[PDB]
Design an enzyme around this catalytic site. Structure first.
Site, PDB file in Angstrom:
ATOM      1  N   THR A  47       0.777  -1.230   0.000  1.00 44.37           N
ATOM      2  CA  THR A  47       0.000   0.000   0.000  1.00 44.37           C
ATOM      3  C   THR A  47       0.816   1.292   0.000  1.00 44.37           C
ATOM      4  OG1 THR A  47      -1.801  -1.155   0.987  1.00 44.37           O
ATOM      5  CG2 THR A  47      -1.875   1.239   1.042  1.00 44.37           C
TER       6      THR A  47
HETATM    7  N1  LIG Z   1      -2.414   7.293   5.077  1.00 51.98           N
HETATM    8  C1  LIG Z   1      -2.465   6.194   5.870  1.00 51.98           C
HETATM    9  N2  LIG Z   1      -1.910   6.153   7.098  1.00 51.98           N
HETATM   10  C2  LIG Z   1      -1.965   5.054   7.887  1.00 51.98           C
HETATM   11  N3  LIG Z   1      -2.576   3.910   7.516  1.00 51.98           N
HETATM   12  C3  LIG Z   1      -3.172   3.805   6.300  1.00 51.98           C
HETATM   13  C4  LIG Z   1      -3.149   4.974   5.401  1.00 51.98           C
HETATM   14  N4  LIG Z   1      -3.795   4.629   4.282  1.00 51.98           N
HETATM   15  C5  LIG Z   1      -4.202   3.347   4.448  1.00 51.98           C
HETATM   16  N5  LIG Z   1      -3.835   2.848   5.643  1.00 51.98           N
HETATM   17  C6  LIG Z   1      -4.142   1.477   6.148  1.00 51.98           C
HETATM   18  O1  LIG Z   1      -3.242   0.494   5.617  1.00 51.98           O
HETATM   19  C7  LIG Z   1      -3.940  -0.704   5.259  1.00 51.98           C
HETATM   20  C8  LIG Z   1      -3.557  -1.066   3.833  1.00 51.98           C
HETATM   21  O2  LIG Z   1      -2.346  -1.825   3.805  1.00 51.98           O
HETATM   22  P1  LIG Z   1      -2.113  -2.973   2.681  1.00 51.98           P
HETATM   23  O3  LIG Z   1      -2.554  -4.238   3.370  1.00 51.98           O
HETATM   24  O4  LIG Z   1      -0.616  -2.837   2.336  1.00 51.98           O
HETATM   25  O5  LIG Z   1      -3.000  -2.594   1.508  1.00 51.98           O
HETATM   26  C9  LIG Z   1      -5.437  -0.418   5.382  1.00 51.98           C
HETATM   27  O6  LIG Z   1      -6.068  -1.231   6.384  1.00 51.98           O
HETATM   28  C10 LIG Z   1      -5.557   1.042   5.755  1.00 51.98           C
HETATM   29  O7  LIG Z   1      -6.498   1.218   6.824  1.00 51.98           O
HETATM   30 ZN   LIG Z   2      -3.197  -1.330  -0.635  1.00 53.74          ZN
HETATM   31 ZN   LIG Z   3      -3.785  -4.712   1.998  1.00 51.56          ZN
END
Ligand SMILES: Nc1ncnc2c1ncn2[C@@H]1O[C@H](COP(=O)(O)O)[C@@H](O)[C@H]1O
Ligand SMILES: [Zn+2]
Ligand SMILES: [Zn+2]
Length: 382
Positions: A47
């Site tokens: 992400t």
């Molecule tokens: N700007 C941000 N700051 C902190 N956490 C985030 C942000 N944007 C998304 N997330 C969290 O990171 C997770 C996504 O991580 P992933 O599993 O790598 O897609 C989601 O559960 C979001 O709630």
């Molecule tokens: Zn993501």
């Molecule tokens: Zn994720």
């Protein structure tokens, strides 16, 4: 007054999910405007790295956000919930589009885009906020709608919107689950409400819109989780990260033992010295990458031992962080607006190419980047 750009990210929306009859608003938007067959994420397909690539045009190996979780000799530790790391501009390389916008005297408003809580190159967005879990769909839509409608000196050339819901449902239940589909439908409906509101406000007609995701989502069926300590025992190397991209730092004097046990091909993963990682991933030069990097095969997780234990060994789940070329990791790209083409389809392309298009739509000089400006020229109306 130049046309504004609204940039929407739907975390974890896989490219094929537009073709299942669950995205009426996004499907209509695509028919009106431009849609790519898919958009490939950059390595690693996580992400923070990919959202930051989207807005800088740089591969993670160049922009320095090389994983969601990192260690730096000077800056210390970084992970998503560590606010004073995430808010520290020294982690973030390059120039994200909002910095470019603010440096021309125009304004940017961001609803929780990775990097937007820092003053990157000294420049914060005009509007931004600390990311909190469980904000309502209407709450964010109505804020973004507000930001598009602002006039006078506080007019926003760029507005960004982010949804986590599809990604979270994907992790919890898998991409073929009813829960993932329900999330896709809900975010789509929210985007419909935003579009209708923009039309009532008279902002729709003067706003270009890009909808992307950061990566797709693969199924992790039961029994597809191992311990990171199965890859290397803790006495010979420290797992810096778990999940799917597993970084190891050998203990002092243990590089040889670590390499002997880690390097090469294994049952459900492969590992490399970072300098030797597959060239197609364009990853492994950055100092923040651990010495040894393992890539789990599609559909497999490697977890810290205490997580593995509390992993309620029952149902189907989902993960990303796999080889970016996999169809399951494919992301979405679509765009529509006064400066964009109408009823067009584009070949699949790499996510580093989005930045050049956005810089043009934002009237900012394109910072040096890893993308090709030719790729998305056909997305323009002329
Ligand atoms: N700007 C941000 N700051 C902190 N956490 C985030 C942000 N944007 C998304 N997330 C969290 O990171 C997770 C996504 O991580 P992933 O599993 O790598 O897609 C989601 O559960 C979001 O709630
Ligand atoms: Zn993501
Ligand atoms: Zn994720």
């Amino acid at each position: 007054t130049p046309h504004a750009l609204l940039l929407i990210s739907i975390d974890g929306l896989r490219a094929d999910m537009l073709d299942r009859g669950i995205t009426p608003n996004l499907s209509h938007l695509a028919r009106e405007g431009v849609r790519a067959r898919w958009m490939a994420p950059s390595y690693p397909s996580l992400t923070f790295p990919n959202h930051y690539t989207l807005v800088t045009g740089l591969r993670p190996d160049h922009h320095g956000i090389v994983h969601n979780s990192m260690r730096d000799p000077t800056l210390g530790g970084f992970w998503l919930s560590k606010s004073e790391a995430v808010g520290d501009a020294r982690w973030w390389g390059g120039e994200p589009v909002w910095v470019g916008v603010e440096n021309t005297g125009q304004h940017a408003a961001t609803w929780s885009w990775p990097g937007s809580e820092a003053a990157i190159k000294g420049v914060r967005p005009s509007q931004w906020r600390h990311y909190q879990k469980g904000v309502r769909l209407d709450t964010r839509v109505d804020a973004v709608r507000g930001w598009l409608a602002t006039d006078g000196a506080q007019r926003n050339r760029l507005v960004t919107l982010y949804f986590e819901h599809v990604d979270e449902a994907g992790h919890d239940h898998g991409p073929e689950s009813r829960q993932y589909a329900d999330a896709v439908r809900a975010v789509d409906a929210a985007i419909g409400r935003l579009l209708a509101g923009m039309q009532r406000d008279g902002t729709r007609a003067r706003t270009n819109i890009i909808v992307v995701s950061d990566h797709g989502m693969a199924e992790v069926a039961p029994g597809h989780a191992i311990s990171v300590e199965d890859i290397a025992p803790p006495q010979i190397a420290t797992a810096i990260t778990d999940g799917q991209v597993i970084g190891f730092e050998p203990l002092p004097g243990q590089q040889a033992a670590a390499e002997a046990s880690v390097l090469g091909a294994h049952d459900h993963y492969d590992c490399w010295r970072k300098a030797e990682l597959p060239a197609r991933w364009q990853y492994g030069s950055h100092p923040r990458i651990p010495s040894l990097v393992c890539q789990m095969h599609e559909g497999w997780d490697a977890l810290f031992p205490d997580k593995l234990a509390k992993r309620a060994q029952r149902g189907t789940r989902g993960s990303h962080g796999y080889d970016p070329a996999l169809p399951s990791m494919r992301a979405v790209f679509l765009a529509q607006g006064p400066d964009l083409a109408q009823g067009k389809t584009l070949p699949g392309f790499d996510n580093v190419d989005v930045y050049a298009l956005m810089s043009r739509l934002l009237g900012i000089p394109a910072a040096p980047n890893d993308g090709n400006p030719a790729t998305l020229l056909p997305a323009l109306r002329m």
